[PDB]
Design an enzyme around this catalytic site. Structure first.
Site, mmCIF file in Angstrom:
data_model
loop_
_atom_site.group_PDB
_atom_site.id
_atom_site.type_symbol
_atom_site.label_atom_id
_atom_site.label_comp_id
_atom_site.label_asym_id
_atom_site.label_seq_id
_atom_site.Cartn_x
_atom_site.Cartn_y
_atom_site.Cartn_z
ATOM 1 N N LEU A 16 -16.097 -4.450 -3.102
ATOM 2 C CA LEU A 16 -14.662 -4.625 -3.331
ATOM 3 C C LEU A 16 -14.292 -4.753 -4.797
ATOM 4 O O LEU A 16 -13.177 -4.458 -5.173
ATOM 5 C CB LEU A 16 -14.101 -5.815 -2.549
ATOM 6 C CG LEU A 16 -13.964 -5.636 -1.041
ATOM 7 C CD1 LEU A 16 -13.676 -6.965 -0.367
ATOM 8 C CD2 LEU A 16 -12.904 -4.566 -0.695
ATOM 9 N N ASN A 90 -5.339 -8.540 -4.472
ATOM 10 C CA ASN A 90 -4.742 -9.597 -5.292
ATOM 11 C C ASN A 90 -3.213 -9.510 -5.440
ATOM 12 O O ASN A 90 -2.644 -8.402 -5.422
ATOM 13 C CB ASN A 90 -5.471 -9.748 -6.630
ATOM 14 C CG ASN A 90 -5.018 -8.754 -7.646
ATOM 15 O OD1 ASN A 90 -3.997 -8.969 -8.312
ATOM 16 N ND2 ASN A 90 -5.766 -7.658 -7.797
ATOM 17 N N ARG A 135 -3.385 -13.420 -10.061
ATOM 18 C CA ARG A 135 -4.700 -12.750 -9.896
ATOM 19 C C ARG A 135 -5.636 -13.453 -8.893
ATOM 20 O O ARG A 135 -6.636 -12.869 -8.454
ATOM 21 C CB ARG A 135 -5.436 -12.558 -11.235
ATOM 22 C CG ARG A 135 -5.802 -13.854 -11.903
ATOM 23 C CD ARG A 135 -6.441 -13.708 -13.297
ATOM 24 N NE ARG A 135 -6.542 -15.051 -13.876
ATOM 25 C CZ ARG A 135 -5.561 -15.670 -14.548
ATOM 26 N NH1 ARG A 135 -4.405 -15.072 -14.800
ATOM 27 N NH2 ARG A 135 -5.747 -16.882 -14.998
ATOM 28 N N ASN A 136 -5.315 -14.699 -8.540
ATOM 29 C CA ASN A 136 -6.168 -15.501 -7.658
ATOM 30 C C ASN A 136 -5.558 -15.788 -6.299
ATOM 31 O O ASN A 136 -6.101 -16.589 -5.544
ATOM 32 C CB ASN A 136 -6.574 -16.814 -8.336
ATOM 33 C CG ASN A 136 -7.443 -16.581 -9.540
ATOM 34 O OD1 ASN A 136 -8.164 -15.574 -9.583
ATOM 35 N ND2 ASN A 136 -7.390 -17.498 -10.539
HETATM 36 C C1 627 Z 1 -13.383 -13.260 -6.710
HETATM 37 O O1 627 Z 1 -13.237 -13.763 -5.368
HETATM 38 C C2 627 Z 1 -12.406 -12.963 -4.524
HETATM 39 C C3 627 Z 1 -12.408 -13.560 -3.151
HETATM 40 O O2 627 Z 1 -12.726 -14.740 -3.013
HETATM 41 N N1 627 Z 1 -12.049 -12.790 -2.112
HETATM 42 C C4 627 Z 1 -12.032 -13.362 -0.748
HETATM 43 C C5 627 Z 1 -11.320 -12.279 -0.014
HETATM 44 N N2 627 Z 1 -10.774 -12.080 1.203
HETATM 45 N N3 627 Z 1 -10.196 -10.782 1.194
HETATM 46 C C6 627 Z 1 -10.407 -10.251 -0.024
HETATM 47 N N4 627 Z 1 -9.925 -8.992 -0.307
HETATM 48 C C7 627 Z 1 -10.318 -8.211 -1.300
HETATM 49 O O3 627 Z 1 -11.196 -8.497 -2.093
HETATM 50 C C8 627 Z 1 -9.654 -6.896 -1.438
HETATM 51 C C9 627 Z 1 -9.710 -6.282 -2.679
HETATM 52 C C10 627 Z 1 -9.128 -5.049 -2.887
HETATM 53 C C11 627 Z 1 -8.479 -4.445 -1.833
HETATM 54 N N5 627 Z 1 -7.887 -3.187 -2.040
HETATM 55 C C12 627 Z 1 -7.672 -2.721 -3.207
HETATM 56 C C13 627 Z 1 -6.467 -2.182 -3.447
HETATM 57 N N6 627 Z 1 -5.626 -1.717 -2.374
HETATM 58 C C14 627 Z 1 -4.206 -2.020 -2.641
HETATM 59 C C15 627 Z 1 -5.977 -2.300 -1.049
HETATM 60 C C16 627 Z 1 -7.491 -2.395 -0.871
HETATM 61 C C17 627 Z 1 -8.416 -5.072 -0.574
HETATM 62 C C18 627 Z 1 -9.009 -6.303 -0.363
HETATM 63 C C19 627 Z 1 -11.094 -11.132 -0.836
HETATM 64 C C20 627 Z 1 -11.652 -11.348 -2.208
HETATM 65 C C21 627 Z 1 -10.986 -12.891 -4.988
HETATM 66 C C22 627 Z 1 -10.490 -11.684 -5.536
HETATM 67 C C23 627 Z 1 -9.159 -11.596 -5.943
HETATM 68 C C24 627 Z 1 -8.330 -12.728 -5.811
HETATM 69 C C25 627 Z 1 -8.815 -13.926 -5.276
HETATM 70 C C26 627 Z 1 -10.138 -14.013 -4.875
HETATM 71 MG MG MG Z 2 -10.482 -15.017 -10.097
#
Ligand code: 627
Ligand code: MG
Length: 270
Positions: A16, A90, A135-136
């Site tokens: 991811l 995010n 971002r978090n």
């Molecule tokens: C670093 O830890 C992770 C974390 O703990 N996590 C727990 C957790 N649960 N679900 C998550 N989803 C994704 O990481 C994600 C990333 C990109 C994604 N796409 C990209 C763009 N598109 C618009 C849709 C598909 C779709 C889902 C995460 C990350 C975190 C990351 C970002 C913010 C907060 C926490």
């Molecule tokens: Mg972070």
């Protein structure tokens, strides 16, 4: 320990990105047919402690708007923390990329009510987050938003927590008492929440635009604060400003903040 589970229950689907200590995967808990997120630890760090601290904290909290721990694999490498999958990723990129007719003024209020509800919950249980920022936060379907990334969250024994010598925080989200003396509290979460509102109101601009990181603290001392973003309701800007009061104890509580967004969200719904 009830959160522990067998590594073999999980299959990885895709990387991811977004990880700090290791790759973060989209995986599948096979027996439940459930897509999950899986945070992994690179065997070759001595950041094992902090990684495990995140996991320990997530066992102790639970709220519709806090990303949910599902289980862990921590009896030997590679370590896993398993968390509910949020499909949109995010909040920051979600705001930059969205269709603003959909994610409109009523949705903005909805997002803030969601986050303040979570933060009110944390306040109540004497927890601090310490990394509240777009971002978090994580986004699901229909502008569901959840606070996530609990690596820095702590249960305080008093009303204050002091980070250890050498710790560095992101300048533009961090309360002055925290920048100056490493003092964190529910009230420093309130400051960041204020910055988080500004991020929401601007659909994810970087705060203190063009302002040199080195001069932000000094500007804060002299009572410089970000101006009202375009389109931002006056009541919302008052709250943002209340969040940025120099003295911690002049900042509203998250119960007061949630109460005010709850009201505003309801009135807008007519
Ligand atoms: C670093 O830890 C992770 C974390 O703990 N996590 C727990 C957790 N649960 N679900 C998550 N989803 C994704 O990481 C994600 C990333 C990109 C994604 N796409 C990209 C763009 N598109 C618009 C849709 C598909 C779709 C889902 C995460 C990350 C975190 C990351 C970002 C913010 C907060 C926490
Ligand atoms: Mg972070």
């Amino acid at each position: 320990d009830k959160w522990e589970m067998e590594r073999t229950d999980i299959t990885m689907k895709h990387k991811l990105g977004g990880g700090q200590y290791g790759e973060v995967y989209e995986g599948v808990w096979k027996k439940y047919s459930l897509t999950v997120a899986v945070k992994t630890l690179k065997e070759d760090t001595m950041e094992v402690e902090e990684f495990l601290k995140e996991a320990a904290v997530m066992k102790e909290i639970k709220h519709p708007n806090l990303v949910q721990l599902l289980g862990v694999c921590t009896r030997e490498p590679p370590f896993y923390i398993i968390i509910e999958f949020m499909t949109y990723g995010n909040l920051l990129d979600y705001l930059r990329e969205c269709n603003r007719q959909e994610v409109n003024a009523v949705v903005l209020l909805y997002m803030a009510t969601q986050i303040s509800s979570a933060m009110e919950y944390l306040e109540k249980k004497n927890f601090i987050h310490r990394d509240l920022a777009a971002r978090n936060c994580l986004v699901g379907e229909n502008h569901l938003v959840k606070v996530a990334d609990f690596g820095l969250s702590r249960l305080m024994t008093g009303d204050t927590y002091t980070a250890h010598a050498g710790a560095k925080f992101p300048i533009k989200w961090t309360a002055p008492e925290s920048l100056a003396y490493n003092k964190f509290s529910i009230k420093s979460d309130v400051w960041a929440f204020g910055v988080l509102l500004w991020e929401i109101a601007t659909y994810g601009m970087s705060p203190y635009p063009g302002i040199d990181l080195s001069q932000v603290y000094e500007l804060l001392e002299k009572d410089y604060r970000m101006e009202r973003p375009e389109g931002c309701p006056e009541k919302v800007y008052e709250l943002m400003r209340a969040c940025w009061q120099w003295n911690p104890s002049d900042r509203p509580s998250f119960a007061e903040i949630h109460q005010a967004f709850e009201t505003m969200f309801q009135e807008s719904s007519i």
